[PDB]
Design a protein around this ligand. Structure first.
Ligand code: EMO
Ligand code: CL
Ligand code: CL
Length: 328
């Protein structure tokens, strides 16, 4: 059957850590005092949680409270451990506390306040300079978590929280994140549709950090071309067709052939034959100010079928695209 695959970076990071670092199931949670926090306003509800603006009365400071809808104790211990492991890293949201909600009878995670503005609200009106700035900020977070043996697996605009006033950015919702263990098969039902990598859409389970680099490419493509979403499928099948209509079918077959993967036969009446399009195709009078040779070279190196050929976060940080961005 399928050919095995392994990350080309940070391959062995968890194999060398102590069990406690990755054996999240065996994590003993440390509970604070729910009384410290007063909920103020419901901000959002997803499939797995409700998010509240709250205040910590024991210091008067604003926090964000995420009350975990019941899902699976593993997934709850998973997110908590990952957040503790990544706490303090560049541009990672900071878990401040964990308390029991008395009404829900479930864990509530308390995070340090971020402004109520996700990236999707602003990423379509940014200057060329700011797209690069904020991409580099996102890259800091991704390389950090990948270096720590963790893939986010749900990179998308809504999961990027941005304080555009203070030019600050946080990567949030680590509820789908997982520890990378070389040779391990993962669930392909992660990420939002538009941001799903081809590996997920062809049901290839032995994926890695590079999945996140595909989603980041989908965000970049959407910002520089002002097309939201860039790959707009009506379902998971058409999503791959949408990608094929840009990257071409010959490279898709080369990919699945490399990994000895067999597409769903559903694809035969739907996929057709498509050439690789040149990126200049998606440039027009309304986005040309956001497009440059460097942008297009960079995007090209992110948006590749073969998850092994994509730029890593760190390589992405080296790209000439970021040379105009002032570094701290
Ligand atoms: C509308 C909205 C506003 C937010 O501030 C957050 C979220 C949603 C959110 O989902 C979220 C998830 C999370 O894991 C950590 C957070 O700080 C958050 C958030 O902070
Ligand atoms: Cl999962
Ligand atoms: Cl990486």
């Amino acid at each position: 059957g399928p050919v095995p695959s392994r990350a080309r970076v940070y391959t062995d990071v968890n194999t060398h850590r102590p069990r406690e670092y990755w054996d999240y199931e065996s994590h003993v949670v440390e509970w604070g005092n729910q009384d410290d926090y007063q909920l103020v306003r419901k901000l959002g509800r997803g499939k797995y949680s409700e998010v509240f603006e709250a205040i910590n009365i024991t210091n008067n400071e604003k926090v964000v409270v995420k009350i975990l809808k019941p899902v699976k104790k593993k997934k709850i211990k998973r997110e908590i451990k990952i957040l503790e492991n990544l706490r303090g890293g560049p541009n990672i949201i900071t878990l401040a506390d964990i308390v029991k909600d008395p009404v829900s009878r479930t864990p509530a995670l308390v995070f340090e306040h971020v402004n109520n503005t996700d990236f999707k609200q602003l990423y379509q009106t940014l200057t060329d300079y700011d797209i690069r700035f904020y991409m580099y900020e996102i890259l800091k977070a991704l390389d950090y978590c990948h270096s720590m043996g963790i893939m986010h697996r749900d990179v998308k605009p809504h999961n990027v929280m941005i304080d555009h006033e203070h030019r600050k950015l946080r990567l949030i919702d680590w509820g789908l994140a997982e520890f990378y263990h070389p040779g391990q098969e993962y669930n392909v039902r992660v990420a939002s549709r538009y941001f799903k990598g081809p590996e997920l859409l062809v049901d290839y389970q032995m994926y890695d950090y590079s999945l996140d680099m595909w989603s980041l490419g989908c965000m970049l493509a959407s910002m520089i071309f002002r097309k939201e979403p860039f790959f707009h499928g009506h379902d998971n099948y058409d999503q791959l067709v949408r990608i094929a209509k840009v990257l071409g079918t010959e490279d898709l077959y080369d990919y699945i052939d490399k990994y000895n993967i067999e597409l769903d036969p559903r694809f035969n009446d739907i996929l057709g034959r498509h050439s690789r399009k040149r990126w200049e195709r998606f440039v027009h009078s309304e986005n040309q100010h956001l497009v440059s040779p460097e942008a297009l070279d960079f995007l090209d190196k992110l948006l590749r079928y073969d998850h092994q050929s994509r730029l890593t976060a760190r390589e992405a940080m080296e790209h000439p695209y970021f040379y105009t961005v002032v570094k701290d």
